[PDB]
Design a protein around this ligand. Structure first.
Ligand SMILES: NC(=O)C1=CN([C@@H]2O[C@H](COP(=O)(O)OP(=O)(O)OC[C@H]3O[C@@H](n4cnc5c(N)ncnc54)[C@H](OP(=O)(O)O)[C@@H]3O)[C@@H](O)[C@H]2O)C=CC1
Ligand SMILES: NC(=O)C1=CN([C@@H]2O[C@H](COP(=O)(O)OP(=O)(O)OC[C@H]3O[C@@H](n4cnc5c(N)ncnc54)[C@H](OP(=O)(O)O)[C@@H]3O)[C@@H](O)[C@H]2O)C=CC1
Ligand code: NA
Lengths: 286, 287
């Protein structure tokens, strides 16, 4: 159980440190303000006096701060101190910011793995917790068991920026699945059906929805959209009806109105018998 | 079991309904404007009526599945008299209002009326995980439960005949969303030469996680207590914004993220930064 350093003891940094201690790793920490380490120190962490001391304590440095501007302000000065060590950046940001950091890290002989956490702090340590990871194969490989302490590490390849990009893509799905659940909850609420009554029907249906995705994917990749069954035409009509029925029943229309718009835009450019997969082309053109 | 059944409408869906009744040894009487479509069914043992009225009179329970409720109206209205005292099961697709009118009309003519919405393709009828939302007469539901389970897992939602359509539309909303956002994600990753099928298994696992968040969200939507220490509106709205910008930077459109960003921010505007995502139901209701 090798010594690890954590920089940044916000809610997520504190949980990374805590999971290291619960696996018996000597855990050295730093934060710009010291009182935030107090609980971790009671639990056997060592609060370093400066960032630089903290880095010199461990072969692996985990950084987790608000954003990549804060991360650059903190890491830039530590360049020579980090050289020869492994750096894992679980700060959240864009593909570009991770790509920048990876560039900088390579200048200085810093083995750089960028990760994006898909989970809350209470989630650090649970196998349900996915960490997307991208960058140094060596760091991923060498410190796998270390990373697996925070959750299931999905190593996506060498482009530092892929974890952010996958994370944002997936969050897309979540945001949109949740918005539409609450849309339907509101709609059924106009007949005094509650969200908790609706939920199991939604959970069942989601099983069907996931079963549709392999075929949609296949057509998205091939470019051959033609279907005989779930025509874009009829789906566009569906969305219009969902929108109108939502209004009739007494709620807003934003969720169905926006989908109608995008689906109808493809219908206006594509074919009546286009599959839903054809939306990918409209989405690209934007 | 094995009562007489009539099916009006032998389109893709109507045939597969009659098919299943028949398969399971129901005396099945069918009618369809175009008689030729009754071919195989008559061959596998179904009785083609000469008129729809003849078909109605042949059975205590009548199943109707045609293009829409306008055609169903023009087809059923003239049959009000011969329908009296029978069970009508309407599996035509339509709006809640259309179902409600149908159930009104049915009541004012002594017809027991269950309305239904099939959440499956014809080749799914009789298969596992086909789901039929049902609403209207419980008695019809009760008396014909075995008949109905031949088609799929019947889900009786209550007395109001509009419910099956209303739930259906609410569920389709989820489908249309999850699909769009799946393709948005596939588009985005396509810019780094990741295929939709490489993306797929990530999405399949993650969907399971999203599914696991919905119980908590549903509870807050119903309680009105939106507070969270973990994923508040503020960081979600920021994330949405970031997904938009990154989408643009990587070289695709922003339709899906941009629309989501706006909707979630609307609540933020009105509410608190530490509101959970459940809070969004409030925005959608007051719209
Ligand atoms: N929390 C969540 O639900 C999720 C979080 N994430 C990401 O995880 C990362 C960590 O977030 P978290 O640590 O919990 O956030 P907090 O704001 O709670 O902590 C951020 C850390 O940055 C430090 N910091 C240094 N300079 C600054 C500055 N100028 N302004 C603000 N903070 C500064 C803070 O020190 P100090 O103690 O002195 O403030 C603190 O250590 C983020 O990049 C976040 O977006 C990802 C998924 C979900
Ligand atoms: N198929 C599917 O995947 C799904 C279907 N549904 C719903 O099931 C219902 C039936 O669709 P489906 O069977 O696929 O459609 P088809 O177009 O294959 O069949 C339409 C049926 O309606 C009849 N019809 C149309 N116009 C008239 C008219 N003026 N007078 C009398 N009969 C008429 C047709 O008679 P004729 O043969 O003489 O034209 C035929 O029996 C629809 O409400 C559909 O939306 C629900 C979910 C999915
Ligand atoms: Na060293």
């Amino acid at each position: 159980r090798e010594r690890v350093t954590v920089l940044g003891l916000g809610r997520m940094g504190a949980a990374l440190a805590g999971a290291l201690l619960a696996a018996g790793h000597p855990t050295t920490v730093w934060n710009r303000s010291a009182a935030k380490a107090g609980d971790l120190v009671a639990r056997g962490a060592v609060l370093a006096g400066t960032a630089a001391e903290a880095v010199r304590a461990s072969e692996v440095v985990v950084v987790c701060v608000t954003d990549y501007d804060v991360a650059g302000d903190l890491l830039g000065p530590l360049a020579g101190e980090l050289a020869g060590r492994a750096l894992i950046n679980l700060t959240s940001g864009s593909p570009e910011q991770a790509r920048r950091s990876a560039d900088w890290a390579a200048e200085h002989g810093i083995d750089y793995l960028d990760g994006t956490i898909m989970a809350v702090p209470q989630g650090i340590g649970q196998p349900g917790s996915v960490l997307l990871l991208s960058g140094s194969a060596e760091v991923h490989s060498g410190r796998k068991a270390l990373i697996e302490l925070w959750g299931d590490g999905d190593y996506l390849g060498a482009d530092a920026g892929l974890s952010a990009l996958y994370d944002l893509a997936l969050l897309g799905v979540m945001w949109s699945t949740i918005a539409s659940f609450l849309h339907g909850a509101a709609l059924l609420g106009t007949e005094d059906v509650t969200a908790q009554q609706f939920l199991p029907k939604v959970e069942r249906w989601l099983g069907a929805v996931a079963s549709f995705l392999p075929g949609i994917a296949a057509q998205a990749d091939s470019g051959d959209y033609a279907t005989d069954v779930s025509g874009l035409d009829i789906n566009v009509a569906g969305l219009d009806l969902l929108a109108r029925v939502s209004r009739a029943q007494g709620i807003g229309t934003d969720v169905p109105a926006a989908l109608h718009e995008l689906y109808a835009r493809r219908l206006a450019q594509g074919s009546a018998n286009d599959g839903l997969a054809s939306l990918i082309d409209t989405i690209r053109r934007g």
